[PDB]
Symmetry: C5
């Protein structure tokens, strides 16, 4: 096929072209299996070439140049053509530390990925915090139906972000743990064992590579703790939501039971009113002191039975 290559030289100059994969393997001195890019996160060195893939960002770091592959249709235009050249050129920062190009390229790629991981968390966190805050207030019998889908979607994005940080840390820690892997990153040292050793002023050794990789492992470790705390907060907030729903359930069920007692009291003493309303000879239809006596009994009796019933639920706490 073809690889859309954006090539940065040691001076930060940007050249973009297109080359066949078969010809690129010979030009880079690699094989077809080296540039398969079939791992979502991987930082490997194959024949003096640093091959890194971070999700959509596939790059190869050569002794003298940095190549970005498959840079189209991925919003890799502002960083690639305006921010990346400045970092690779070495301008500013410190002029007393002329580190090799591999250190500048590895730092630029690692910094870029830690920025997208940080940016993803800086967007998820306000969304989850604002959705959980209004879902957890104990002032409603129910919850917002639409905002539960937001929490479900944002929780899924949080778990995918947690994996992205986790596999970023594993890739860096794999190189840090093994000294041979860490030494392989010093690409210019092996390309020129004599020219690079001439400037033996501590420009790049095992310490400088370890310091660079440990810096981004700790930055990603900060992301892991912040993303893990957010996931813990989601679980804690949902448990408070469950107590809120089941507490107002009991409040409405107590009011319903109190009103049920009142309707039973009226029905119990309204039965004698219904009984005395039948069109049968009650032998009392002529008395003038029976209607008001029964009417008083029904109203007072309903009140007394209601008061007695209300103490029944109070007895049941």
């Amino acid at each position: 096929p073809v690889f859309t290559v954006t090539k940065f030289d040691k001076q930060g100059n940007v050249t973009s072209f297109e080359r066949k994969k078969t010809e690129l393997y010979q030009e880079l001195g690699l094989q077809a299996r080296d540039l398969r890019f079939q791992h979502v996160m991987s930082i490997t060195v194959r024949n003096n070439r640093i091959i890194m893939r971070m999700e959509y960002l596939k790059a190869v770091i050569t002794p003298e140049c940095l190549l970005i592959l498959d840079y189209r249709n991925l919003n890799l235009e502002q960083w690639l053509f305006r921010e990346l050249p400045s970092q690779l050129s070495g301008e500013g920062q410190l002029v007393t530390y002329p580190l090799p190009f591999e250190f500048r390229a590895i730092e630029a790629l690692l910094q870029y990925w830690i920025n997208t991981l940080q940016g993803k968390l800086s967007i998820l966190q306000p969304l989850i915090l604002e959705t959980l805050d209004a879902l957890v207030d104990p002032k409603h019998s129910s919850v917002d139906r639409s905002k539960l889908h937001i929490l479900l979607q944002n929780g899924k994005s949080l778990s995918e972000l947690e994996t992205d940080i986790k596999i970023f840390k594993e890739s860096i820690l794999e190189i840090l743990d093994e000294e041979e892997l860490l030494e392989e990153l010093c690409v210019s040292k092996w390309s020129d064992p004599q020219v690079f050793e001439k400037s033996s002023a501590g420009i790049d050794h095992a310490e400088e590579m370890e310091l660079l990789l440990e810096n981004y492992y700790r930055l990603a470790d900060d992301l892991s703790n912040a993303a893990r705390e957010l996931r813990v907060l989601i679980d804690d907030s949902q448990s408070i939501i469950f107590i809120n729903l089941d507490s107002h359930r009991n409040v409405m069920m107590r009011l319903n039971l109190q009103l049920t007692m009142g309707t039973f009291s009226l029905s119990l003493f309204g039965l004698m009113g219904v009984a005395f309303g039948m069109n049968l000879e009650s032998s009392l239809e002529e008395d003038h002191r029976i209607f008001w006596l029964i009417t008083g009994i029904m109203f007072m009796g309903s009140g007394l039975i209601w008061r007695r019933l209300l103490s029944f639920l109070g007895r049941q706490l």
Copy 2:
């Protein structure tokens, strides 16, 4: 008994026959304990023979041939006779890497198992996603009864798939961790310490075996993260289902309580209508301005008591 053997030579030729287990041990130079195949996942080397079992796939890799055992009644016909010979023959790919037959056979077997593990996840994931998506919508008082059995069955298949990936990774990592185990896989090297060493051009050494095994450990590690995220999503979606069920429970319980208040108001003020309907002398049956006054009181009184009761639940939030 007998072993149904499908034998592939160094040229990919397929020969199928049947041999007694006792005779196969002598032919292979093995013992009865070596070919017990009592472990669901195992990759061991016994006397210059690579013995691998992956669930139903049992294979022995010899210096010059690959044997597949118990290949019947397992749908091992398309891969065995059409896809496996092409991979073992070495055609295509790279003609500049004449790797030994053991590397080709190990890669073909490891690739096949990572494809079935990937295929199992590629089927479970859409089924779980589509069942969870329609179970979680907050537009129904209840959930689909039949689709809960689908989620239960698919969740069980997901946990069995998670174990299959987990024990696949452990088997590969066991060989990767120990250099002696990794060196044992170089079967042709030990069979011919001089003939194999003649082609000392980096065809097969500790790096090539490590690169092959690390490739499939990372492919299975990708499967572990994808299957673990799916299990996390199931738990997150069920918690949202619980909030949905308990929120509409509170909505229906609030409507029921509001209607209960209305029926109590009618019953409370309908008692005086029942009282005035008895066949007793009320001393008011002749007045012409008492019927409409009481009728108005009952209807207005029911409304006022209902309005007062509705504020009672509003006071209870």
Copy 3:
């Protein structure tokens, strides 16, 4: 006190007797602290003697004999007198592998314990599967009261079985990890450094002991995964049970609310029927076109209010 000893010689002959603990220490060349048997799972070697305890099975493996202690009232009669002698005698299997008696005794004891652990799971699994299957069907408002106690008891037995497998694996892995511990198991080698070394044909070395112990670690590892999946299935099934109970709760609560609306509609429009049934002058008792008009209003009005109320809950989704 006394130890009920069942002694098996190198030929598998069974002798049972009773000896005092104090005399047994001198006969075995051990101490009182060595045979305390105070650990539920332990495989230790003390002065050229392999001392193993597996729950109720306490055994000491000597250079020339195997002793089983406290074999009474534990159903250790079929295995001890019919199955164990055959395995220790070395008959069958392979006649070309004259392994020492310690290998035969360790294998027989380890095989026996992996069989009881497998048998315990082969009984728990059908019981849990059949109880969960009928508890999870979404065709009942509630669950079987009696079968919840079965699940509680079987879940407790599953967790105790999980610990039995876990501590069995730890005991084997402790010996496997340390080469000195693994070498101590070669009891006959240290008893006869010259006689055993005479048959230097690979009968028993570090590989044969490691292969035997790794075989039973992997068999127990299979048990751990099967028992862990069952525990995961219990948790998954209970969550589906909770959704089933809370979905039929909402179905019955929706039917109750729909019938509550119908009774309120009848009560609301039955109040005018009660109002017109009082024994007061309504100034309409003589008209012939008022009774049927009011009766129609009550029945039609109840229907219209019921239809309007039914749309109210539909508005609330």
Copy 4:
């Protein structure tokens, strides 16, 4: 200040006195930072002195004596003056193993703490088992209100006990893992490099110290599994309690809905009875075959509507 010291010599003699902390540091050859006792669990050796703290038990093991500090108001009277002297004196047990005083003192202190940890579990376990057993029976609509506080308190004590076992195991495993730490416990060896080496009969070496410490690590490991299983059982029992509560909730809700259907049927067909009871001209008050016809319709119609409604919930499963 002052330290309340209970001193045991090599013969088990008990002497109790009080000494200032400043003078005790010089007498013991220690510093103020060594005897801070600010760690709840700690077993450290500082200048040939074994300093151990186990919650309230603070002890210093010297070459020739064992000192217990802060032994007042802690029920340390029966063990200190009646049980501890017997163990330290070396009487009974084995007279052929004249182990140094440090081994006897370490064993006595470690045995005492494993007894209090075992005793705490032997009290919690029956309390939790008896509370869970009667809370889980499916014969009550609710649970015992008072016994939920017992489970909450006993669960809190179980988690504190789990930490006590966990940090006891970590303290022992720290010494076991490092050989230098294990060698420091041989206090008499370093105090008298020549006198102790004279009795080179295996009285105390790296094996005897390792055997003593591994014995109590495994005893505490047994406690960890028993306490962990109890915590798992609490969680399993509570989930069964939730199913019990939500199953009888559905049973009472089905009975209430069935009775609600019956009251609606009476109200629906009682409306025509109320309609025919108004004091309006119905044009049917003179017929003799209308009263019983309507009365039959109301009673039969209520039954038919009730039967039809009962099938409605049966349709909803």
Copy 5:
């Protein structure tokens, strides 16, 4: 920019000033990347300087002085100017241990952070305990709405505190695990390899640094267990809250069902009273022994049906 520096010399004298970052790098012999302070918890040594950050506390420990950076608007006035000088001066404590300034500065900084971590837990624990205690009492149908927000906020602060302790332990354990990292803390040793070695009386070696760092790892380990137990107690208490809410839900639902049975009984037998109240010829309006017979049937029949219905729910347990 500028760094607000509070400088403490070897005598504890406090000097506060303001210096530009660029000039401070040259004065301290460091680089811009060394003082980035972009890690929430970090204890690193860069060119004979101990650089530590603990949340808001950023400090650099030099051979002869301790510098605190960004000390404004953080309540760092009482500790900085009244408590810190006393600890750094070396007054009191022990005059026989003239440890270097780095040991005094590291101890003062580590002690300060363990005090703020302890103080945060000493505030959270009473707040959570008092909120959980009154939320868990089984004497209310519901829970306090306002106190659920307190538990949610305090649970979030507890999880952030748990991370603060966790990363404090990781930072200390990283130095403890690696001897080279631990040796780098001995700043005065490398600054003066001969002057420091002159006082070879055990003032500061690998043991003294290890003892200081292990002391604060164990103090933070105590905090981890106390904060972890509190989080476990929150989860246990919430599960008891759920049982309390669902038990009183069943109690109120049983009372409501018992009263529903009573109202159905009155409605069932009140239908014959309504039937006999219609203005139709019942052919019984003249009999004198029919009114009281029907009235008795309605009242007795309601009681008998109610008693029969009450046994129905008793049959359903």
